[PDB]
JSON list of C-alpha atoms and ligand atoms in Angstrom, two decimals:
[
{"chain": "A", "resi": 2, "resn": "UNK", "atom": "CA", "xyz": [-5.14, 6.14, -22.22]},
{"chain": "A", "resi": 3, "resn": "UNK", "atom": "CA", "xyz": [-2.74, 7.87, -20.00]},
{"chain": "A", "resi": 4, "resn": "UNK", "atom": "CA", "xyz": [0.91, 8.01, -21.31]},
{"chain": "A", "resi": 5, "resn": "UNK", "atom": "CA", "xyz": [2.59, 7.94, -18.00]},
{"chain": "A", "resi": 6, "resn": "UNK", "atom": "CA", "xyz": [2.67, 5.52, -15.26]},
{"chain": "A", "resi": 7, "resn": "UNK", "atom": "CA", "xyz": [-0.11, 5.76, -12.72]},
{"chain": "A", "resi": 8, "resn": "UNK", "atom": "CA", "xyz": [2.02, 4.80, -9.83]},
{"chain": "A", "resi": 9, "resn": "UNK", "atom": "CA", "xyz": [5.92, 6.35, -10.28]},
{"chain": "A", "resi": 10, "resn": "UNK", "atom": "CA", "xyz": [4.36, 9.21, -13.38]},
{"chain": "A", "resi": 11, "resn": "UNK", "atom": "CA", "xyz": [7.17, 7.77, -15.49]},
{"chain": "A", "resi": 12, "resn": "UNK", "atom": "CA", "xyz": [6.51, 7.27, -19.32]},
{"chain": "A", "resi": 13, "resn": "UNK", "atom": "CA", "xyz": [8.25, 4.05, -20.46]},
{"chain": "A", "resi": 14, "resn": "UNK", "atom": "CA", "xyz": [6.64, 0.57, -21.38]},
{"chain": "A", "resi": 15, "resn": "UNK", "atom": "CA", "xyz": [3.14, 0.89, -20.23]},
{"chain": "A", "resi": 16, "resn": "UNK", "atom": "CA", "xyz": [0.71, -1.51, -20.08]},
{"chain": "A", "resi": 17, "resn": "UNK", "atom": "CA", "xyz": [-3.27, 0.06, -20.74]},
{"chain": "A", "resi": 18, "resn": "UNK", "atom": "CA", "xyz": [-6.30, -0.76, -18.90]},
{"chain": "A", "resi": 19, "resn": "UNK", "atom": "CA", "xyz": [-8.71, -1.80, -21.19]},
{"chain": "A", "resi": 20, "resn": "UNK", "atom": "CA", "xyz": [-12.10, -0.18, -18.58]},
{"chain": "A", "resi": 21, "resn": "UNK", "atom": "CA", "xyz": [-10.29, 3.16, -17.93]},
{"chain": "A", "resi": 22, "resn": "UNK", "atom": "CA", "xyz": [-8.01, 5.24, -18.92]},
{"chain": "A", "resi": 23, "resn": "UNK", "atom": "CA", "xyz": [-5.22, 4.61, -16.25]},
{"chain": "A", "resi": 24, "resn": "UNK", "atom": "CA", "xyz": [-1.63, 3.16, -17.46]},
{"chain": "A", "resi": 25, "resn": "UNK", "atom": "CA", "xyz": [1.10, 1.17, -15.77]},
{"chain": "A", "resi": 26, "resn": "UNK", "atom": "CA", "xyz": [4.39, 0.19, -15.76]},
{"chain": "A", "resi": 27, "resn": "UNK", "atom": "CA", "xyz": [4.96, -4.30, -15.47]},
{"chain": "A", "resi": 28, "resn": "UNK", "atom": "CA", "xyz": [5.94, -3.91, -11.58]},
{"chain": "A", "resi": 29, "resn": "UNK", "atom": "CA", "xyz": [4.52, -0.64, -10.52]},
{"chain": "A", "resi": 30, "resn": "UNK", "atom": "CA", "xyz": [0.95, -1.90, -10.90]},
{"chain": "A", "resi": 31, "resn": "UNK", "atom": "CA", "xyz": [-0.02, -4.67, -7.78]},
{"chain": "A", "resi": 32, "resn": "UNK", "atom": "CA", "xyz": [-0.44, -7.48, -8.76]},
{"chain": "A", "resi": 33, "resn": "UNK", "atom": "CA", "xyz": [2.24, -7.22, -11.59]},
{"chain": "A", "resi": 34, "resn": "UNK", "atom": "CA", "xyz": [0.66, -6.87, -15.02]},
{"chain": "A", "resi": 35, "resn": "UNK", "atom": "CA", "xyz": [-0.84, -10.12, -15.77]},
{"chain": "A", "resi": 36, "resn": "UNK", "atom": "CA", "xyz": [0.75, -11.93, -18.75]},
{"chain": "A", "resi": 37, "resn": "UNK", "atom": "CA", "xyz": [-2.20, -12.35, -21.18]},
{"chain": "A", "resi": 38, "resn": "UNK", "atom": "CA", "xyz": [-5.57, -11.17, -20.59]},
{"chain": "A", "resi": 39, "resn": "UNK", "atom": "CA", "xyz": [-7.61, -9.27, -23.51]},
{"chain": "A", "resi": 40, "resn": "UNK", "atom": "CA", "xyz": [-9.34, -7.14, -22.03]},
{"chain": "A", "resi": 41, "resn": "UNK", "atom": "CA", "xyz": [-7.38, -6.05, -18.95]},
{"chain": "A", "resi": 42, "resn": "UNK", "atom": "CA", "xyz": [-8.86, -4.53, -15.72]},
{"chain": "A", "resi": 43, "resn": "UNK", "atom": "CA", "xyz": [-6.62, -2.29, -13.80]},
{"chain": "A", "resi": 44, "resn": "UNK", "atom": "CA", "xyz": [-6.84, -2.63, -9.68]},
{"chain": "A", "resi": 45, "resn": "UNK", "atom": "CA", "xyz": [-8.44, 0.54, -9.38]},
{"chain": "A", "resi": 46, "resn": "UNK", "atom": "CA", "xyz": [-11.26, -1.10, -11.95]},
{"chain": "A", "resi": 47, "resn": "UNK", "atom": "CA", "xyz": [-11.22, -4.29, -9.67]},
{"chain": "A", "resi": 48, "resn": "UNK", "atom": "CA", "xyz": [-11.95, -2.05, -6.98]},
{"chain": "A", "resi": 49, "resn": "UNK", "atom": "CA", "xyz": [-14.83, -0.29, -8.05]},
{"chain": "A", "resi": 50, "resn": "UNK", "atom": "CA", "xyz": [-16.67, -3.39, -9.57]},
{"chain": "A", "resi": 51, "resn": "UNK", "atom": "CA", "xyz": [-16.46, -4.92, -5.52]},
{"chain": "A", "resi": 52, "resn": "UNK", "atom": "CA", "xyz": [-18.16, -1.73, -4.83]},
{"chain": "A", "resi": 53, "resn": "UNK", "atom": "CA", "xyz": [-20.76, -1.89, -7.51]},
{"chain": "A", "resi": 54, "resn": "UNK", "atom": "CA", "xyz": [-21.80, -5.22, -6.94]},
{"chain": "A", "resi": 55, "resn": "UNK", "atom": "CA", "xyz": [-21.76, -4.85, -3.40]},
{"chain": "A", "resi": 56, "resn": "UNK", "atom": "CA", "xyz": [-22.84, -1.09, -2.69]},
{"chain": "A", "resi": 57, "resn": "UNK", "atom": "CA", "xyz": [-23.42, -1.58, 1.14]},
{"chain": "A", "resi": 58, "resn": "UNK", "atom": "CA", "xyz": [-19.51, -2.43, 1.48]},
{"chain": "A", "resi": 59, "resn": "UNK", "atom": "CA", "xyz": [-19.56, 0.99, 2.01]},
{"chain": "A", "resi": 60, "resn": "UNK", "atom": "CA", "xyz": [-21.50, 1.32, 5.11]},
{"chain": "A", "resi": 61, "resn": "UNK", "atom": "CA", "xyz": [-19.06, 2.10, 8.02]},
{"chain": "A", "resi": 62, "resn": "UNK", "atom": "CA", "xyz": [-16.75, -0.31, 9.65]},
{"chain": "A", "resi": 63, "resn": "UNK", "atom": "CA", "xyz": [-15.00, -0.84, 12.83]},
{"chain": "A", "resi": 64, "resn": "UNK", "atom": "CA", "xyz": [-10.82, -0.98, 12.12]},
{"chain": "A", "resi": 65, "resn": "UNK", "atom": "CA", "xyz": [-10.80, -3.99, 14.72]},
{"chain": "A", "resi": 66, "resn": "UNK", "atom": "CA", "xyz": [-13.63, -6.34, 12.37]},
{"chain": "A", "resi": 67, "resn": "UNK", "atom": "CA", "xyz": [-11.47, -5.66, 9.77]},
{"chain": "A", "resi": 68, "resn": "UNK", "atom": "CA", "xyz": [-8.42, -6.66, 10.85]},
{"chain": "A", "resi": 69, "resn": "UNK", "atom": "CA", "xyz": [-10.05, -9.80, 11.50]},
{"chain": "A", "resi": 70, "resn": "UNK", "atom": "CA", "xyz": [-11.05, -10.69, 8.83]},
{"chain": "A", "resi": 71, "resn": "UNK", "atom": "CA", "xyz": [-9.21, -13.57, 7.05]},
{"chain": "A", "resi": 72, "resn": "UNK", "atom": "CA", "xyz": [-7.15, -12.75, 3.79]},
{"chain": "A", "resi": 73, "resn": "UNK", "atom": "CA", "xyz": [-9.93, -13.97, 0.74]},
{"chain": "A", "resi": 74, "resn": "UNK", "atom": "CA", "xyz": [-9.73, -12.98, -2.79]},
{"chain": "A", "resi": 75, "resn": "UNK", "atom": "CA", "xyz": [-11.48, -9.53, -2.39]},
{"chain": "A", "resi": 76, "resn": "UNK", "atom": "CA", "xyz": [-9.22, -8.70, 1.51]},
{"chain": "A", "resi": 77, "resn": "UNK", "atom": "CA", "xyz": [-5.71, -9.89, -0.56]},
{"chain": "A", "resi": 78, "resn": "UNK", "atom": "CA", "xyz": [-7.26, -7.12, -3.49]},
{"chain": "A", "resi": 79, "resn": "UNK", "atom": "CA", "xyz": [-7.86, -4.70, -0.87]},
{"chain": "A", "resi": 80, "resn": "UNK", "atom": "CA", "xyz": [-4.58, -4.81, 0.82]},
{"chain": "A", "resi": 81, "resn": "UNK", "atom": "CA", "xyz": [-2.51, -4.82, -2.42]},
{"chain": "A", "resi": 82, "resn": "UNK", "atom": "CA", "xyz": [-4.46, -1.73, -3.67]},
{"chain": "A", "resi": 83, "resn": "UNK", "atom": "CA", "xyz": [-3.60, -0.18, -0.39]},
{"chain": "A", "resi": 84, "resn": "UNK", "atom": "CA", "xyz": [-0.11, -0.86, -0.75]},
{"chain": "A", "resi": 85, "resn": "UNK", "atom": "CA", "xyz": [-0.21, 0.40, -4.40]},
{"chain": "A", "resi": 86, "resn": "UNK", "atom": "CA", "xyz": [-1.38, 3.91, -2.97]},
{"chain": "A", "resi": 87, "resn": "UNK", "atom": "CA", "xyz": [1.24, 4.72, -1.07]},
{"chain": "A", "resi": 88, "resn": "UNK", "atom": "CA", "xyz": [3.80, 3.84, -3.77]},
{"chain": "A", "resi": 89, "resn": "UNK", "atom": "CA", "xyz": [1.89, 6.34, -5.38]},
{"chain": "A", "resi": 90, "resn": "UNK", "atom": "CA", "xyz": [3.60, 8.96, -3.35]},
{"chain": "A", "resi": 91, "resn": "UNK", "atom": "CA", "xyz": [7.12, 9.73, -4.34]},
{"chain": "A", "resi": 92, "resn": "UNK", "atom": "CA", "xyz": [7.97, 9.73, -0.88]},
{"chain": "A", "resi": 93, "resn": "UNK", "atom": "CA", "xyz": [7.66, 6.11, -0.79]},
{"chain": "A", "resi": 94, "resn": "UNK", "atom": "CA", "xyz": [11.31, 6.09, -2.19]},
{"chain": "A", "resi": 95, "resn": "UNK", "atom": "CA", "xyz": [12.38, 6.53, 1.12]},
{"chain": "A", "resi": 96, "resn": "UNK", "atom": "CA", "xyz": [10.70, 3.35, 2.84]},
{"chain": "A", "resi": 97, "resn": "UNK", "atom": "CA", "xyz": [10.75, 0.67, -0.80]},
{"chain": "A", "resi": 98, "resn": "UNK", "atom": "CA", "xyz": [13.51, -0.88, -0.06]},
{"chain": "A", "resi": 99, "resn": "UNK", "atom": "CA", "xyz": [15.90, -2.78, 2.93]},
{"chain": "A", "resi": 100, "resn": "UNK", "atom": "CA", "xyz": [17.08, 0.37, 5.13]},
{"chain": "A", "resi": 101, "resn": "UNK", "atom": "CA", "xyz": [20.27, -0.13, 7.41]},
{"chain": "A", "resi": 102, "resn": "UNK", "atom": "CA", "xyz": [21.11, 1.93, 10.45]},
{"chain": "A", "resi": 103, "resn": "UNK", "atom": "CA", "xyz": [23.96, 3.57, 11.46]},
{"chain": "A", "resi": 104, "resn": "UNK", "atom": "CA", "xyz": [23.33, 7.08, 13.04]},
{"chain": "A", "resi": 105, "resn": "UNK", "atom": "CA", "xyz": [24.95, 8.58, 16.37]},
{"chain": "A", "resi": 106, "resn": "UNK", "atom": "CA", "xyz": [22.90, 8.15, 19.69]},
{"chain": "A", "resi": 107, "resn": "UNK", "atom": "CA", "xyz": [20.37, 5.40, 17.69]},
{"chain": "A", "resi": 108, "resn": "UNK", "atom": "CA", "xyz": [19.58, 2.18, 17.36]},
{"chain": "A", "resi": 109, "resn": "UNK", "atom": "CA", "xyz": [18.16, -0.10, 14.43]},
{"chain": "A", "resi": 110, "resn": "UNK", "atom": "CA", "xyz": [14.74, -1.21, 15.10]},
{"chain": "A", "resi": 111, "resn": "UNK", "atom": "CA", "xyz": [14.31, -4.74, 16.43]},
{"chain": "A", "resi": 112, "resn": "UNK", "atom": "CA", "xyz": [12.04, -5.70, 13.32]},
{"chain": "A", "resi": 113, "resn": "UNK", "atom": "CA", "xyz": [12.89, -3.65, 10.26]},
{"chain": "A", "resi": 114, "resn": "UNK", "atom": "CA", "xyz": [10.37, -3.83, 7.59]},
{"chain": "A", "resi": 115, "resn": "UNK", "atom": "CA", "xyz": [9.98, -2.09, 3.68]},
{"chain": "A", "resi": 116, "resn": "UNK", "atom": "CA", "xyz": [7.56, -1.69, 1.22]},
{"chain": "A", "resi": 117, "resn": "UNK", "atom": "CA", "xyz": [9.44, -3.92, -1.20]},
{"chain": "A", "resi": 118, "resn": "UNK", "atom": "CA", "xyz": [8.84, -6.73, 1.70]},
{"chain": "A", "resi": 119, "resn": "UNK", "atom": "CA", "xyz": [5.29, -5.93, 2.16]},
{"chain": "A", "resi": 120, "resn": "UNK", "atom": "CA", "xyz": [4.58, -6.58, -1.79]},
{"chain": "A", "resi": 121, "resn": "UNK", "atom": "CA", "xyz": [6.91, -9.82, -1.64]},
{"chain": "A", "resi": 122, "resn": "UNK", "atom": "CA", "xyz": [4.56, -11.14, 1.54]},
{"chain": "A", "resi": 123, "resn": "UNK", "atom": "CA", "xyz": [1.64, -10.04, -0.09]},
{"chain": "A", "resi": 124, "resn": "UNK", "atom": "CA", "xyz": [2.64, -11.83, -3.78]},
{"chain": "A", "resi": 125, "resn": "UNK", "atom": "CA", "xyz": [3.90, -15.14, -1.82]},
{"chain": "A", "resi": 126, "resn": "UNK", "atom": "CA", "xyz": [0.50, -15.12, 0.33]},
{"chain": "A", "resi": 127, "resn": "UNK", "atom": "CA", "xyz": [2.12, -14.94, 3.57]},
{"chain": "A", "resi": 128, "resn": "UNK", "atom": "CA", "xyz": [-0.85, -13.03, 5.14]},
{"chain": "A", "resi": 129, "resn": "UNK", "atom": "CA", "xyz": [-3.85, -14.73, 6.50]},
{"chain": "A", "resi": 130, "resn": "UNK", "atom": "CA", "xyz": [-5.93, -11.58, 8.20]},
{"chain": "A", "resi": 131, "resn": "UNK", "atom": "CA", "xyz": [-5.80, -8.02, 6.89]},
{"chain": "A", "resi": 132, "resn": "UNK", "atom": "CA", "xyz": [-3.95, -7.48, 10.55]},
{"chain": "A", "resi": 133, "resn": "UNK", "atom": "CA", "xyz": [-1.09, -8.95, 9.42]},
{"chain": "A", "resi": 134, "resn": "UNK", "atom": "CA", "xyz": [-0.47, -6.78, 6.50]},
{"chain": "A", "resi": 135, "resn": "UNK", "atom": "CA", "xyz": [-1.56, -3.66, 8.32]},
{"chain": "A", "resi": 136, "resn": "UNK", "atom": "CA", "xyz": [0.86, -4.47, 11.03]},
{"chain": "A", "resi": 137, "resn": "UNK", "atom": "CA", "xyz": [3.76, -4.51, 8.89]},
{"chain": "A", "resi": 138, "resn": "UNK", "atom": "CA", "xyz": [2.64, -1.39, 7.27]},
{"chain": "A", "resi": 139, "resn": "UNK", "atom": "CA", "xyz": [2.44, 0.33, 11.08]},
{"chain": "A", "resi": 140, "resn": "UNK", "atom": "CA", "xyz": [5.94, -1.11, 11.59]},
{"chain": "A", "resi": 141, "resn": "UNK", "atom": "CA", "xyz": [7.64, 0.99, 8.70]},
{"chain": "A", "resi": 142, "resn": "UNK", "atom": "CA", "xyz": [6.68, 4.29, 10.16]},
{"chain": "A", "resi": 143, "resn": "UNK", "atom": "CA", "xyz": [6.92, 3.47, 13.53]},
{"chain": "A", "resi": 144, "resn": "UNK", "atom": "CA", "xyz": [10.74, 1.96, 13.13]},
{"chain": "A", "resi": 145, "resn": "UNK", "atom": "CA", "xyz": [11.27, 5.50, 11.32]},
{"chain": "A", "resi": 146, "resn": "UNK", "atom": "CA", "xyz": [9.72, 7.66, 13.94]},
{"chain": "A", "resi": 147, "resn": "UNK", "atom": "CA", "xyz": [11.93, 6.16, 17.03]},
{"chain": "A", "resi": 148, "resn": "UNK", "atom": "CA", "xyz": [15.24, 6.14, 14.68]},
{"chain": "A", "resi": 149, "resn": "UNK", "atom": "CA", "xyz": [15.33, 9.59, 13.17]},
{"chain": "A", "resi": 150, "resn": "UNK", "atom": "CA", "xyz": [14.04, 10.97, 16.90]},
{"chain": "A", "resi": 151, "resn": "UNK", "atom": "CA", "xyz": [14.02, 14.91, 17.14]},
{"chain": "A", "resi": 152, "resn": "UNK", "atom": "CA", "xyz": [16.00, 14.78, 13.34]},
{"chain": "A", "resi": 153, "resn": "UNK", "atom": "CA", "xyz": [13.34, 16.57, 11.07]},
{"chain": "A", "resi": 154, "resn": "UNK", "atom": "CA", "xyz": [13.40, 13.44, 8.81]},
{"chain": "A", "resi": 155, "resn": "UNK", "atom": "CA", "xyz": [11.25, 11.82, 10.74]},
{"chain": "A", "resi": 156, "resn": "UNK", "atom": "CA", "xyz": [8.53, 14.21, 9.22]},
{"chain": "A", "resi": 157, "resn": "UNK", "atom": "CA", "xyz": [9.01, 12.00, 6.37]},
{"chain": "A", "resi": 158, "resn": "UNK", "atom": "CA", "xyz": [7.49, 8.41, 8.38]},
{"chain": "A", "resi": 159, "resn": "UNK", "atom": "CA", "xyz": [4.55, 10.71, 9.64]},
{"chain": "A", "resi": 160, "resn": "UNK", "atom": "CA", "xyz": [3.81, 12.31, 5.82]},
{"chain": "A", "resi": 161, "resn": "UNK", "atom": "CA", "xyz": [3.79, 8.59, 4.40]},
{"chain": "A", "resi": 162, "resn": "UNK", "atom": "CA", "xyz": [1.67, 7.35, 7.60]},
{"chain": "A", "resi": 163, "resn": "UNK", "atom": "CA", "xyz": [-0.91, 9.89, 6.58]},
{"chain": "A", "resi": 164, "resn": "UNK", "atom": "CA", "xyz": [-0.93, 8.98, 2.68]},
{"chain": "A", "resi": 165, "resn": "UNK", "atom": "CA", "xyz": [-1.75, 4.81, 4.41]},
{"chain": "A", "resi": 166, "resn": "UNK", "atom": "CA", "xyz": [-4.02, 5.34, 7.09]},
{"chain": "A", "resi": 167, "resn": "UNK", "atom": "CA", "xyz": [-6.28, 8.25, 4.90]},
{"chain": "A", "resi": 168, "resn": "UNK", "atom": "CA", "xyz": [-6.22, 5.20, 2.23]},
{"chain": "A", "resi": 169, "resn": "UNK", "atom": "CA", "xyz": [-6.95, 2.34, 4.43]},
{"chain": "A", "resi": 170, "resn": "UNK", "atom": "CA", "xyz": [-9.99, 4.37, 5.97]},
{"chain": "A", "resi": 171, "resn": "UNK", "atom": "CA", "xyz": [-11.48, 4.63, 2.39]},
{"chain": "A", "resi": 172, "resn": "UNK", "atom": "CA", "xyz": [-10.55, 1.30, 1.34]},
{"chain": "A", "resi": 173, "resn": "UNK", "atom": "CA", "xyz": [-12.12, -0.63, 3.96]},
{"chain": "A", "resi": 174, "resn": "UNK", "atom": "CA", "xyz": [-14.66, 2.05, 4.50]},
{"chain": "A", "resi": 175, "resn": "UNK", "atom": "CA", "xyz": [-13.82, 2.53, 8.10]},
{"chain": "A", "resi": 176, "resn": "UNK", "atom": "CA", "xyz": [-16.62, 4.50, 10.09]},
{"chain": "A", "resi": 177, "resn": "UNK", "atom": "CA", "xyz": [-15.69, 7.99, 10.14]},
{"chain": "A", "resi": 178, "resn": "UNK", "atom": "CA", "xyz": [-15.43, 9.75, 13.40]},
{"chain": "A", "resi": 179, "resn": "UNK", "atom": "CA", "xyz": [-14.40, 12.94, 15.34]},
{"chain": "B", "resi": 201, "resn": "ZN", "atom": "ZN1", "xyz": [5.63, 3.27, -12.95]},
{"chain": "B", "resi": 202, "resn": "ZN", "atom": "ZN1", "xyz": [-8.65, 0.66, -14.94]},
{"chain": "B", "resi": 203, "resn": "ZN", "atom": "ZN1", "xyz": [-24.25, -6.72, -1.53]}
]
């Protein structure tokens, strides 16, 4: 096995996958390492195993059927792999947790939202269509973008866009197009 951290490329207490050689810290991998469990399958394992037993699941799909689609097993899997890639970045750090607002000629965003808040909803089951989780996802850049206006920081909500929308086009095997 690795002997860093997947997610955060920390060494530390890591937890091995037992059908690859990925490691994790307890609360970087999504869901949180399970308890017990011999063997242990990482999310990226769960992943490909969906794929493999289902190979057409890679066919191209329009973004709007998947949206609504209702938040099963295999769409809650999805989603929290998702999320998992962009904490993969390290410039995630800048969108984990609460954000406050206090900045000459702005305003705070009617709805803030964080990645931290994303994994709660998605842990407490609070989504019932893939729309709902994608929509909060949106929301972090967005709020980002119309804060930080012509500062340069706002580079940082478009970088971290990229990093989600690249991965949910993968993910849910979105038809590619021009
Ligand atoms: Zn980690
Ligand atoms: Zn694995
Ligand atoms: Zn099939």
């Amino acid at each position: 096995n690795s002997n860093i951290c997947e997610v955060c490329n920390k060494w530390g207490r890591l937890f091995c996958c037992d059908t690859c050689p990925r490691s994790f810290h307890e609360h970087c991998h999504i869901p949180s390492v399970e308890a017990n469990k011999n063997p242990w399958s990482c999310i990226f394992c769960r992943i490909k195993t969906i794929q493999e037993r289902c190979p057409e699941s890679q066919s191209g799909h329009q973004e709007s059927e998947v949206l609504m689609r209702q938040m099963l097993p295999e769409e809650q899997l999805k989603c929290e792999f998702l999320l998992l890639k962009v904490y993969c970045d390290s410039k995630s750090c800048f969108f984990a947790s609460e954000p406050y607002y206090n900045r000459e000629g702005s305003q705070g965003p009617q709805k803030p939202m964080w990645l931290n808040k994303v994994k709660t909803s998605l842990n407490e089951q609070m989504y019932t269509r893939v729309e709902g989780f994608v929509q909060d996802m949106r929301l972090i850049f967005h709020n980002h973008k119309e804060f930080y206006r012509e500062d340069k920081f706002t580079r940082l909500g478009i970088q971290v866009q990229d990093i989600f929308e690249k991965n949910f086009r993968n993910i849910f095997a979105i038809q590619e197009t021009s």
